[PDB]
């Protein structure tokens, strides 16, 4: 043993035992507050967290004395590397405080911004609750557009200046930790080293994500073409049969998930899905019974049972006392073998599946509890959720439900219900993949300076049309920040974990169903009573992150790379059905059609000569607003206060050419007819020429 190796091992022994005691007290204080929300409990939580954070910072500096090049043991070296990560501490105290001010301002704007009705300024809405209820259930085109544009106009424009300074500060922090940029720093979770044949480079992630998305695209286009056909029934006027989908009609504020579109896209209306909620009520189930069934499922595959302290310390039901709690299902790993679950459990089918998902997190924690303290994690950031998903997949199958008595013994499954079930799965799983891939691609290019600030908004909607097949209902300039209107962007969270978790979960399920000798389509598989499948899963769970994530992946699936073929196998019955439903339709989209292109007027200007700057564009909109006021006052005998914000400009070329259209004040859904705008331009044609000093040849309105 090397002398440096001996000194480092002695240092890590004292740290590991001290950190367990301090981290456990911090978790226990947090648990007491979450199940008992008082001012006194909040004070205790803050004090315990500060003590644990102070200890960690002091020990991190002591770890800087060890040279990782001299350490030969990979386990000791991996612990020291984790303890040497400075993070935000690399910045000077002046800039660290500046970044914290920006981060807190963006989080406060997001959670407290309000959009208000134009007719009644006194009636305002928050994002949650409020606009989220509208965007989930409304089928009113005009009302959905009001909430979509109002959120980005009122809140997104406040975040635009703050996000520009946030990018500069994050790149300065990343370079101080020897990274290319902040996006490169975020991709370090997937870095693997130390074993020959299992190395994974940071730059490999970008190429591998693009390669996997290419094989997903043919399936996503069939789902896109099917949803477009159904939405033409709901919105006959507003949908092009060959173009993109309007962004405000996707069942979500950002269209991250298409789950809420299911009532409008049901393949078979007279074949409802399997809802065992009524059977649980008729058999007098309770919350404790639900978690006992989940425990039986894990024992049948060979996993250990819950500890005695799990049943006494958990909060499985909503308290009936004067105690106020947070009702969000979470699994807690306090330390020292203390495992708890906090859940406000109802007797419903949805809560039955959530109990299996949360106890899967507990099983993962229990498996790697024997690892050193700093190595008690998942293999990478996408492993933990992938384990939780596959448990819910097996518990929801009709074969599993018949074996636990929630379905009759003579229950028969028809293939029309199977298509209903698979279509609902694709609206959540397949639909979110292009959204996740496109968003993280945009942020990566922003951190690399591939996209300048002057083109942030422009590149966002070019990639929406190209990759996602989604078109914006109103044009946006560089005063907007549409990415930042999402929670994960304005709250400084990486997003690629949702893309990789989806791929991992179907690789895991296909491997475990093969170990269970399942014969049939992959979506009908149940791994219950299979101790061979539980042995492969346990070989991966107990590793933690003490080795390369590629080696842990190969223990369960037998390969070291991401693969989307198991995902394509899971949705094969739906893929065959979709190609028959889209036989007479168009598959694919064109990126030129837009909801506002039919009422736009083309403007061509040849100055050569003053530069056509942003100030000259502001003057043009005011001149158009002036012409609209005069036309309404003279030809229609109406007084309408048209302003420069009622003029919408799109497709601005480096040469002087663009399009514009006019909307009515207070109403972004009321577009003025193009014929009436032409009459307005014709009436004041002479004065517009005098404003810009350009005759009919230098400045021309096409179509007039």
């Amino acid at each position: 043993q090397s002398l440096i190796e001996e000194k480092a091992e002695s240092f890590l022994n004292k740290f590991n035992q001290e950190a367990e005691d301090l981290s456990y007290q911090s978790s226990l204080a947090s648990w007491n507050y979450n199940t008992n929300i008082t001012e006194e409990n909040a004070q205790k939580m803050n004090e315990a967290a500060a003590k644990w954070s102070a200890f960690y910072e002091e020990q991190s500096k002591i770890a800087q004395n060890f040279s990782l090049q001299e350490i030969q043991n990979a386990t000791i070296k991996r612990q020291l590397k984790a303890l040497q990560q400075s993070g935000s501490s690399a910045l000077s105290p002046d800039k660290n405080k500046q970044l914290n001010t920006i981060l807190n301002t963006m989080s406060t704007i997001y959670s407290t911004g309000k959009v208000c009705n134009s007719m009644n300024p006194q009636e305002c809405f928050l994002l949650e609750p409020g606009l989220d209820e509208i965007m989930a259930t409304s089928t009113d085109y005009n009302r959905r557009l009001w909430a979509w544009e109002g959120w980005r106009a009122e809140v997104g424009k406040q975040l635009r200046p703050l996000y520009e300074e946030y990018v500069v500060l994050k790149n300065e922090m990343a370079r101080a930790n020897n990274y290319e940029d902040y996006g490169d720093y975020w991709r370090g979770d997937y870095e693997a080293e130390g074993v020959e044949g299992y190395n994974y480079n940071r730059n490999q992630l970008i190429e591998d994500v693009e390669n996997t998305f290419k094989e997903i695209k043919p399936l996503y286009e069939q789902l896109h073409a099917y949803v477009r056909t159904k939405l033409m029934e709901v919105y006959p006027s507003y949908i092009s049969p060959t173009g993109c989908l309007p962004a405000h009609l996707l069942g979500d504020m950002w269209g991250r998930f298409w789950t809420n579109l299911y009532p409008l896209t049901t393949p078979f209306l007279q074949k409802p899905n399997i809802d065992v909620t009524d059977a649980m009520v008729n058999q007098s189930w309770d919350a404790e019974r639900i978690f006992k069934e989940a425990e039986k499922f894990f024992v049948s595959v060979g996993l250990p049972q819950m500890t005695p302290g799990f049943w006494t310390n958990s909060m499985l039901t909503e308290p009936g006392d004067d105690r106020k709690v947070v009702c969000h299902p979470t699994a807690w790993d306090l330390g020292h073998g203390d495992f708890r679950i906090k859940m406000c459990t109802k007797v419903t089918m949805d809560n039955f599946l959530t109990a299996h998902h949360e106890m899967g997190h507990i099983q993962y924690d229990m498996a790697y509890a024997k690892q050193p303290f700093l190595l008690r994690n998942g293999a990478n950031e996408g492993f933990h959720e992938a384990v939780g998903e596959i448990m819910s997949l097996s518990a929801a199958t009709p074969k599993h439900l018949k074996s636990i008595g929630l379905l009759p013994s003579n229950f028969q499954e028809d293939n029309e219900t199977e298509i209903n079930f698979l279509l609902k799965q694709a609206l959540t799983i397949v639909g979110t993949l292009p959204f996740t891939y496109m968003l993280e691609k945009w942020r990566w290019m922003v951190f690399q300076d591939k996209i300048p600030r002057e083109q942030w908004t422009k590149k966002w909607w070019e990639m929406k049309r190209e990759i996602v097949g989604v078109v914006e209902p109103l044009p946006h300039d560089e005063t907007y920040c549409d990415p930042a209107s999402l929670f994960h962007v304005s709250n400084d969270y990486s997003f690629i974990r949702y893309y990789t978790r989806t791929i991992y979960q179907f690789q895991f399920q296909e491997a475990l169903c093969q170990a269970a000798k399942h014969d049939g389509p992959l979506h009908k598989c149940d791994i219950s009573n299979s101790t061979e499948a539980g042995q492969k899963l346990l070989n991966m769970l107990s590793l933690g992150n003490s080795g390369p994530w590629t080696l842990a992946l190969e223990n369960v699936v037998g390969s070291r790379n991401m693969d989307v073929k198991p995902l394509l196998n899971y949705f094969q019955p739906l893929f065959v059905w979709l190609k028959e439903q889209n036989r007479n339709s168009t598959v694919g989209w064109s990126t030129d059609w837009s909801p506002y292109a039919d009422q736009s007027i083309k403007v061509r200007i040849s100055l050569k000569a003053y530069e056509w700057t942003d100030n000259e564009m502001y003057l043009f909109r005011s001149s158009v607003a002036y012409a609209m006021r005069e036309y309404f006052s003279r030809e229609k005998n109406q007084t309408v206060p048209f302003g420069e914000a009622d003029v919408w400009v799109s497709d601005l070329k480096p040469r002087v050419s663009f399009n514009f259209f006019v909307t009515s004040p207070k109403n972004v859904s009321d577009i003025i007819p193009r014929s009436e705008v032409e009459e307005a331009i014709r009436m004041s044609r002479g004065r517009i020429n005098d404003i810009f000093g350009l005759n009919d040849n230098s400045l021309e309105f096409l179509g007039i």
């Binding site: 091992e9 890590l12 022994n13 590991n16 035992q17 367990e20 005691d21 456990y24 043991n73 386990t75 000791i76 612990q79 250990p304 049972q305 500890t307 005695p308 302290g309 306090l334 330390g335 020292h336 073998g337 203390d338 509890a369 024997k370 690892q371 050193p372 190595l375």
Partner: protein, 193 residues
Amino acid sequence: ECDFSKLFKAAPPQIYNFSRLVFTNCNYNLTKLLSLFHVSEFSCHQVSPSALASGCYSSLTVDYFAYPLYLASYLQQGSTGEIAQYNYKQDFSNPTCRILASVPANVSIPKPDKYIWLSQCYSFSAYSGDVPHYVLPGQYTPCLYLTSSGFDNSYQTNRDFQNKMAATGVISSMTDNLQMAFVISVQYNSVCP
């Protein structure tokens, strides 16, 4: 006759430090011994409860400790929880039976302040992690010397850095009636009713 006075003299120990009595060449009365308690479970193995009272054996062994009744499922044969792993492993190589009971206030048995059992016992090292120590059938845990200080709160860990050992204890509140567990094993004859 076999004397059970040492049972009633002092408080029963905890499960990881169970007391053992061995009887040879004496007359025993199991009916009188168990008549003093409210028996809640009499699960027997390789013998009948009626045949165990009136048999003749060469040796008789009794293991007893304080045990809360709501943890009864964790003492059953084939369990893989922490009770069997680190505290007490029953030896089924001979006919043995397990009795759970409550002590009425009429019986004069001092009772402890609380119930304590170990949740884990292991050796630690930064090179590889934690190596658990599992209790053998009929034998004591190697982490016994680390419980002498006691446990003040649940999930407290008592360490010894010289030999790199750690033990964690879990506490349950003392009940109104002291609850105990008896494990009786026999071998085949000088001990008869």
